[PDB]
Amino acid sequence: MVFQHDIYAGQQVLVTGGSSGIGAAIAMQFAELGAEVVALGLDADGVHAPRHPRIRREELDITDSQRLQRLFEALPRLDVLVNNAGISRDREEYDLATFERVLRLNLSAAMLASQLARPLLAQRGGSILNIASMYSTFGSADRPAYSASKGAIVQLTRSLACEYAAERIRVNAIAPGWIDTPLGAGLKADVEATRRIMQRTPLARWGEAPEVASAAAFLCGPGASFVTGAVLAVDGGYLCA
Amino acid sequence: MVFQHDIYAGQQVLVTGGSSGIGAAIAMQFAELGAEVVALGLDADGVHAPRHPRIRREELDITDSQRLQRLFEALPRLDVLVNNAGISRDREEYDLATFERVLRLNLSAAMLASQLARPLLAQRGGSILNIASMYSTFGSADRPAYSASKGAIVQLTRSLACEYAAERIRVNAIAPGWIDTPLGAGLKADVEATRRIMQRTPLARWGEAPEVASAAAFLCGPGASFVTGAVLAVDGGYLCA
Secondary structure, three states, X not given: OOEOXXXXXXXXXXXXXXXXXXXXXXXXXXXXXXXXXXEEEOOOOOOOOOOOOOEEEEEOOOOOHHHHHHHXXXXXXXXXXXXXXXXXXXXXXXXXXXXXXXXXXXXXXXXXXXXXXXXXXXXXXXXXXXXXXXXXXXXXXXXXXXXXXHHHHHHHHHHHXXXXXXXXXXXXXXXXXXXXXXXXXXXXXXXXHHHHHHHOOOOOOOEOHHHHHXXXXXXXXXXXXXXXXXXXXXXXXXXXX | OOEOOXXXXXXXXXXXXXXXXHXXXXXXXXXXXXXXXXXXXXXXXXXXXXXXXXXXXXXXXXXXXXXXXXXXXXXXXXXXXXXXXXXXXXXXXXXXXXXXXXXXXXHHHHHHHHHHHHHHHHHHOEEEEEEOOHHHOOOOOOOHXXXXXXXXXXHHHHHHHHXXXXXXXXXXXXXXXXXXXXXXXXXXXXXHHHHHHHHOOOOOOOEOHHHHXXXXXXXXOHHHOOOOXXXXXXXXXXXXX
């Protein structure tokens, strides 16, 4: 519908946090454009997992560093890495152990995945896509670790863009807005939060996972050949209001 | 060969500053994807003007407000407006008359074009794309008016994104890096400036006009349905270095 149907034919994509929500939508979008995709995450065969003949679903806790490494070492090729895995524990993040747990998943795992992907991405060139947030810009009183981690991810995106460019690897990020996923269906149960969000969103609706996925397919392809170190907001205007 | 070949079939696009460089490449990219395009600018039949049976070239000084209005009133539809018209007079911009001339073309003309486009864009929805710069972020000692104007263009993008959202018009910008066009072939004649730029560009090359154009084709289409008020850097990493 937007992209030609086999623009990623013969390529391999890996999506962390690929078993639901934005990750699942990203996995599906690359698969539908011809890519073989490995979707990594917890509850790999759950209701929301991406099902497609070109998507291999893998149960893996990406904080298990040694297990992650073995998976990467088994891949014969990799053209695109999407670091989508992320969690928040909301106000529990004020506890230091919980703060560090959030950073370990959201930041450390992305750093490790990027370094493990790097030699494969260097073979023909390729790309890395990280997932940022409205909380890469705004603070969050209710999730300080999640906000810290998303500020970190933007700078890691910029740093690795500089480091990996000589190997023809581009590194970008998407900052999604308020995306309606089953991950946060309780936020809609909060009428007040919803009204506030909608009031500050020019498009006056929730974003959806496939809208993040279409931006992913662009940024990781040949139409974005001069795009590196960039953060693209996909937020219905929320950052502007 | 990234987008479906008739994704803009039946639509109408207007590109200001369409008669050379990035503007010409933008016009051509929409035309190749099925759009009818009006390309406006000075020297409309010059050597660098975009030649295509779906591109109507019009000689028009867009600071001539009344003439601009008549052109818009004659269009039966408009789906996409690209405000690419922009100039710099380098250090002459320290002279106030010249400063204001640069602002008038780069900012005021974009404001007027947007307002004239608005009723047509509202009919079925559509989009506006503005052109920012590295000098929306960095200052420029050598072109203070150009830099000011490009900071202004980013805030205009954000402001009109908020205003126009209820008419289903999205408003975004591209911040190009250093793009090799015959418009600025003299900057390459400067070996020192080139070395300084290349040293700060992770991809270690000039950008090409069609690379900006592919980004335009994404931002102005259905793959960017939740993207408004956004600035996308197309700069080979320059902002990161």
